Amino acid sequence: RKILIIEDSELQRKLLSRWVSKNGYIAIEAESISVAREKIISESIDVVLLDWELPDGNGIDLISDILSTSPVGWLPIIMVTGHTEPEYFKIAIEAGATDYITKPAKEIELLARIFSALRIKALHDQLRETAIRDVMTGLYNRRYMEERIEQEFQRCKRHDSLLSMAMIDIDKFKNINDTYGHEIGDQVIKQLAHELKTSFAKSAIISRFGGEEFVILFPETGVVDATRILDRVRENVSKLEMKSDTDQIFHFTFSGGVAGGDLSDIQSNQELLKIADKNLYEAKSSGRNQIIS
Amino acid sequence: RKILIIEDSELQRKLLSRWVSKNGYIAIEAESISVAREKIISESIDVVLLDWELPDGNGIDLISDILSTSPVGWLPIIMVTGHTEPEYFKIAIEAGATDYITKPAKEIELLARIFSALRIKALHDQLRETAIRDVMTGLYNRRYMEERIEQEFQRCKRHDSLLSMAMIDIDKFKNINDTYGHEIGDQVIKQLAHELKTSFAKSAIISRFGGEEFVILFPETGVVDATRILDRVRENVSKLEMKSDTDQIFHFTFSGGVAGGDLSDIQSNQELLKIADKNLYEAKSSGRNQIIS
Numbered sequence: 179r180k181i182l183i184i185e186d187s188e189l190q191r192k193l194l195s196r197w198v199s200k201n202g203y204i205a206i207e208a209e210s211i212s213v214a215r216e217k218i219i220s221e222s223i224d225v226v227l228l229d230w231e232l233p234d235g236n237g238i239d240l241i242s243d244i245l246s247t248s249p250v251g252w253l254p255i256i257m258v259t260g261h262t263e264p265e266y267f268k269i270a271i272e273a274g275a276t277d278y279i280t281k282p283a284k285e286i287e288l289l290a291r292i293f294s295a296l297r298i299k300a301l302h303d304q305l306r307e308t309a310i311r312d313v314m315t316g317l318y319n320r321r322y323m324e325e326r327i328e329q330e331f332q333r334c335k336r337h338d339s340l341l342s343m344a345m346i347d348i349d350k351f352k353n354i355n356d357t358y359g360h361e362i363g364d365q366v367i368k369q370l371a372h373e374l375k376t377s378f379a380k381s382a383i384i385s386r387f388g389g390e391e392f393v394i395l396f397p398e399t400g401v402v403d404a405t406r407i408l409d410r411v412r413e414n415v416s417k418l419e420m421k422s423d424t425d426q427i428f429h430f431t432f433s434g435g436v437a438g439g440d441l442s443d444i445q446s447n448q449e450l451l452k453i454a455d456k457n458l459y460e461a462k463s464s465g466r467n468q469i470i471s
Numbered sequence: 472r473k474i475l476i477i478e479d480s481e482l483q484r485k486l487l488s489r490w491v492s493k494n495g496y497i498a499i500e501a502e503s504i505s506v507a508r509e510k511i512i513s514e515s516i517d518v519v520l521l522d523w524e525l526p527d528g529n530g531i532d533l534i535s536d537i538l539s540t541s542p543v544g545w546l547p548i549i550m551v552t553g554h555t556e557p558e559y560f561k562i563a564i565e566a567g568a569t570d571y572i573t574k575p576a577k578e579i580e581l582l583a584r585i586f587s588a589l590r591i592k593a594l595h596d597q598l599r600e601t602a603i604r605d606v607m608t609g610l611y612n613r614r615y616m617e618e619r620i621e622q623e624f625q626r627c628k629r630h631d632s633l634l635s636m637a638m639i640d641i642d643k644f645k646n647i648n649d650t651y652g653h654e655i656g657d658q659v660i661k662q663l664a665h666e667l668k669t670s671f672a673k674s675a676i677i678s679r680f681g682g683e684e685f686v687i688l689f690p691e692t693g694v695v696d697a698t699r700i701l702d703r704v705r706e707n708v709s710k711l712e713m714k715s716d717t718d719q720i721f722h723f724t725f726s727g728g729v730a731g732g733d734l735s736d737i738q739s740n741q742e743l744l745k746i747a748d749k750n751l752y753e754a755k756s757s758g759r760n761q762i763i764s
């Protein structure tokens with residue numbers, strides 16, 4: 179939905195912006211690489227349009243520059259250039275660009291390229307989500323966890339076994355990214371993952387359910403025990419001295435909602451997630467850094 | 472590597488062909504849709520270039536026509552048209568095209584579009600393969616296996632062929648998870664998968680049917696022979712020295728039910744699953760680590 183337009187020429191940049199902004203998308207402008215880098219760290223950009231003819235140096239500078247500024251680590255870059263020669267397309271790909279427009283760009287070429295970049299990102303994402311384990315944390319991904327939730331709920335319901343579920347979410351994680359950078363944000367996510375993996379019984383099933391959201395099943399554990407064990411981890415996390423890029427100490431916290439225990443009057447695993455999500459929201463709404471059950 | 476070029480104009484078709492054929496790819500030519508359909512059924516085509524201005528009918532006829540002629544059921548179609556209006560790009564996508572060139576095509580935009588179409592084909596293929604597979608084991612998932620059971624059963628009834636089915640289930644796997652952790656549980660699931668994939672004839676069809684349940688079809692195999700082959704693997708699994716997180720040795724086993732062989736008095740593939748499940752229960756009830764047939 180969000181498109182970054184990098185182009186020195188004010189009239190050409192505003193014309194590209196109008197075309198993006200007209201055809202349903204949100205346009206974001208940069209006149210130099212300087213202001214561009216601010217915008218990739220600042221907002222979550224879905225696609226990049228890049229003038230391959232900028233102030234200083236060609237774009238074996240630029241393309242590689244844009245890619246490692248990216249908080250997520252990869253991003254579709256569409257090249258905008260007057261280089262018509264087939265040779266120049268290859269160098270752009272080998273440099274790590276996604277696509278290519280010969281200027282003067284037509285409304286049609288521009289829409290086509292953006293649609294293609296977004297289709298590939300979406301397919302790339304659907305594929306990464308079929309993986310069992312999240313690469314950065316080693317925890318279960320969402321789709322696998324959803325199959326394990328359905329299975330453990332069916333099993334616990336048939337066997338009149340206890341099953342407690344927690345949904346936790348880092349408190350104001352965007353401010354950690356904005357203030358200290360995405361690399362420090364990664365360290366904070368992996369530190370929470372480490373605490374989650376080292377604190378619960380082997381029997382607990384731990385998922386990275388979203389960017390900074392974690393779902394934990396506690397088979398044979400009632401809501402009161404699950405709450406106290408999760409609250410001890412919440413407490414240990416609030417006391418972690420994290421170090422910034424420049425060695426400043428900062429703290430983070432998470433909020434958590436716990437649902438289930440006795441499943442006798444919970445008809446489905448979706449109802450269990452609904453209750454954990456409601457308790458999460460109540461935790462988020464009542465001062466954060468707490469557990470609601 | 473192989474690109475189909477559909478274009479009436481002989482001069483334009485040969486020019487597109489030269490550009491494809493020059494830049495490392497193989498060019499395959501069609502002057503009408505008739506010749507085109509012969510080429511998609513005949514050879515394995517990686518990408519389609521399509522003239523949206525052909526002899527007969529518009530191109531919401533053409534695009535949907537090319538798609539379902541495909542033996543694989545999908546193909547990346549790049550549109551080649553004089554329709555420069557933004558509106559016309561959307562119609563092409565909603566019709567099911569992959570990409571779009573405004574004629575007269577430049578060598579550069581043609582190569583760019585083909586590169587894009589090949590990245591999408593590659594992701595589309597990897598995804599179709601995850602959709603029939605259990606990602607953790609590389610075996611068929613349950614959804615595929617139910618359809619493949621129905622097909623092999625109907626095939627074996629047409630040919631009066633033998634078809635034996637085994638349903639296996641890991642013995643006290645919950646205690647393995649609770650004692651050793653879900654990571655170790657997953658390694659146990661993959662280790663069983665490895666044994667199942669390395670032990671049977673090529674023609675055997677192996678599925679992960681559920682969390683810790685696997686269904687194996689043995690086409691042209693009687694119950695007694697399937698039982699021997701399965702019991703040898705049951706025995707090999709019982710001997711595997713699995714290692715915990717802290718290098719503690721443990722063993723697992725599975726129980727098995729074998730059904731079928733002669734299908735003459737089994738009216739449907741469900742009756743086959745029922746009998747394998749009954750014999751599984753008898754295996755589980757009589758001390759586990761055994762096969763009942």
Ligand SMILES: Nc1nc2c(ncn2[C@@H]2O[C@H](COP(=O)(O)OP(=O)(O)OP(=O)(O)O)C[C@H]2O)c(=O)[nH]1
Pocket residue numbers: 222249347348349350351352353355359360361362363364367388389390462
């Ligand atoms: N560093 C980093 N940041 C990530 C990652 N995945 C997602 N994020 C970022 O985390 C943020 C998501 O947090 P939000 O859901 O906005 O809420 P929040 O900022 O934590 O606020 P709240 O207190 O309501 O939870 C923005 C998103 O880009 C990741 O892998 N690494």
Ligand SMILES: Nc1nc2c(ncn2[C@@H]2O[C@H](COP(=O)(O)OP(=O)(O)OP(=O)(O)O)C[C@H]2O)c(=O)[nH]1
Pocket residue numbers: 329333640641642643644645646648649652653654655656657660681682683755759
């Ligand atoms: N690691 C892991 N374990 C799984 C997975 N799916 C299921 N499980 C485990 O399977 C367990 C099934 O337990 P039960 O149905 O009581 O059967 P069992 O414990 O295997 O005992 P039985 O011998 O009667 O089959 C629950 C869960 O711990 C999975 O994908 N990974």
Ligand SMILES: [Mg+2]
Pocket residue numbers: 185186187229231232
């Ligand atoms: Mg410029």
Ligand SMILES: [Mg+2]
Pocket residue numbers: 347348388390391
């Ligand atoms: Mg969140």
Ligand SMILES: [Mg+2]
Pocket residue numbers: 347348349350351390
């Ligand atoms: Mg948050």
Ligand SMILES: [Mg+2]
Pocket residue numbers: 478479480522524525
């Ligand atoms: Mg023509």
Ligand SMILES: [Mg+2]
Pocket residue numbers: 640641683684
């Ligand atoms: Mg079972």
Ligand SMILES: [Mg+2]
Pocket residue numbers: 640641642643644645683
């Ligand atoms: Mg079992």
